[PDB]
Amino acid sequence: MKFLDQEKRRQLLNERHSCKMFDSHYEFSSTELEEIAEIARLSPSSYNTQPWHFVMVTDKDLKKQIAAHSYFNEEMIKSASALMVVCSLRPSELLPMQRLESYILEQCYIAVGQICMGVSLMGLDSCIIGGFDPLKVGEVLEERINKPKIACLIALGKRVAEASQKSRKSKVDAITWL
Amino acid sequence: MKFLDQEKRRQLLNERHSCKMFDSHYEFSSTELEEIAEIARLSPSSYNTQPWHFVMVTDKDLKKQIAAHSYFNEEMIKSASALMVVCSLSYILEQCYIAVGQICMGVSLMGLDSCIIGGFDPLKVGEVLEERINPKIACLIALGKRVAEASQKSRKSKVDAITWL
Ligand SMILES: Cc1cc2nc3c(=O)[nH]c(=O)nc-3n(C[C@H](O)[C@H](O)[C@H](O)COP(=O)(O)O)c2cc1C
Numbered sequence: 001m002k003f004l005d006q007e008k009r010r011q012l013l014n015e016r017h018s019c020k021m022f023d024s025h026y027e028f029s030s031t032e033l034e035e036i037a038e039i040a041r042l043s044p045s046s047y048n049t050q051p052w053h054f055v056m057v058t059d060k061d062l063k064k065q066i067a068a069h070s071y072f073n074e075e076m077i078k079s080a081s082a083l084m085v086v087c088s089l090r091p092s093e094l095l096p097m098q099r100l101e102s103y104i105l106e107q108c109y110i111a112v113g114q115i116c117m118g119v120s121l122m123g124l125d126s127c128i129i130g131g132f133d134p135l136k137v138g139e140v141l142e143e144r145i146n147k148p149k150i151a152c153l154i155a156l157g158k159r160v161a162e163a164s165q166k167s168r169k170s171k172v173d174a175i176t177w178l
Numbered sequence: 179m180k181f182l183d184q185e186k187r188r189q190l191l192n193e194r195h196s197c198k199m200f201d202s203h204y205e206f207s208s209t210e211l212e213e214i215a216e217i218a219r220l221s222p223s224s225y226n227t228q229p230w231h232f233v234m235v236t237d238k239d240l241k242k243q244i245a246a247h248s249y250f251n252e253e254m255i256k257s258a259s260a261l262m263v264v265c266s267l268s269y270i271l272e273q274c275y276i277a278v279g280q281i282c283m284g285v286s287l288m289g290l291d292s293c294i295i296g297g298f299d300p301l302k303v304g305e306v307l308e309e310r311i312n313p314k315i316a317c318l319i320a321l322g323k324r325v326a327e328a329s330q331k332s333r334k335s336k337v338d339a340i341t342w343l
C-alpha cells in the first residue's frame with residue numbers, strides 16, 4: 001500500500017529542504033492554506049494532548065513586522081507566501097528546562113517534522129525558523145492574540161531557486177545496527 | 179509539481195496512524211531497513227547540528243527484551259518487524275522529535291506502519307542496550323506491517339487548533 005516508489009520517496013527527502021528564498025509573486029490559495037492546517041492538526045502526540053496552536057500569518061504588513069525582527073531571516077520571511085507561528089500551549093491548558101514545558105515542545109517538534117513533509121508532498125517549500133527576537137515577535141502579535149509561547153516559526157511558499165545540497169554526518173555517526 | 183494529488187495526500191494523513199499491533203510474520207528487507215535509517219538521518223535541525231542518534235533493533239530476542247519493559251506496549255513491540263530507539267546526544271536536544279515526525283511520514287509513504295512509544299522504563303531499557311551504546315533514550319518507534327485498517331482520527335476542533343491571520 002505504498003504512495004510513492006523508491007525514486008520518488010528518495011526525491012522527496014531531498015525536496016524537503018530549508019528554502020532560503022520564496023517566490024513573492026506566488027500567493028497561497030485557501031485550498032493550500034487549509035491543507036497545511038490539516039497537516040499540522042492531524043499530527044501525532046503523546047496521549048493525544050495536541051499541546052499546540054498554529055497561527056497562519058498571511059497579511060504582508062503583519063508578516064513584515066515579524067520579519068523586521070528575524071535578523072538575517074528578514075528578507076526570507078518577507079518573501080514567503082505564509083508564515084506559520086508554532087505556538088506551545090500553556091501547562092494550565094495541557095492539564096484539566098521546565099518538565100511540562102519541555103514535554104509540550106517535544107510534541108510541537110513532532111508536528112513540525114510532519115508539516116514539512118506534508119508541504120513537500122503538495123509541491124511547495126518551507127523553512128523552519130528559530131533565528132528571531134522572541135520578545136519582539138510576541139509584541140507585534142499581542143493585541144491580535146493572547147501572548148503566546150513560541151516554539152518555532154515555519155516560513156512557507158514556492159521556491160525561486162533549486163534545493164540546496166544535503167549536508168549530514170555519516171550514516172555510521174547517526175545509525176547503529178542491531 | 180505534486181508528488182501526490184489531493185486525494186492521496188489527504189489519504190496519507192489518515193494512513194499515518196498509531197498502529198497498535200503488527201504482522202508478527204512480516205520481516206524487513208535490508209532495503210526497507212536502509213531507507214528508514216536514511217529518512218531519519220536527512221531530518222532537519224538547528225544550524226544542521228543533528229543532535230541525535232538512531233538505533234535499529236531487529237533481532238527478535240533483544241526486541242523481546244525491550245518489549246518486556248515497555249509496560250502496555252509489550253505485545254506491539256514483539257510483533258513489529260523492527261524497533262527504532264531514538265536517542266539525543268533552544269533547546270536543541272529535543273530536536274530528535276522533529277526527526278520522529280519526518281520518520282513516521284516517510285514510513286507511511288513506503289506503505290508500512292509505525293507507532294511512537296513513550297511508555298517504557300528508561301532504566302531497564304537502557305540497561306539491556308548499554309553493553310553497546312554509550313542514550314539519552316528519548317522515545318521508541320515500532321516499525322512493520324499492519325494487521326488491520328488505520329484507526330479513526332480524533333483531534334480537537336480546527337477552531338481550537340488554528341488561528342487565521
Ligand atoms: C511521544 C509519543 C509517545 C507515544 N506513546 C504511546 C504509547 O506509549 N502507547 C500508545 O498506545 N500510543 C502512544 N503514542 C501514540 C498517540 O497516542 C497517538 O499519536 C495519538 O492518539 C494520535 O493518534 P494517531 O497517532 O493514531 O494519529 C505516542 C505518541 C507520541 C507522539
Ligand SMILES: Cc1cc2nc3c(=O)[nH]c(=O)nc-3n(C[C@H](O)[C@H](O)[C@H](O)COP(=O)(O)O)c2cc1C
Nearest residue numbers: 016017018073128129130131152222223224225226
Ligand atoms: C529549530 C530550527 C530552527 C531553524 N532556524 C533557521 C533559521 O533561522 N534560518 C535558516 O536559514 N534555517 C533555519 N533552520 C533550518 C536548518 O538550518 C536546516 O534544517 C539544516 O541546515 C539542514 O538543511 P535542510 O533542512 O535543507 O536539509 C532551522 C531548523 C530548525 C530545526
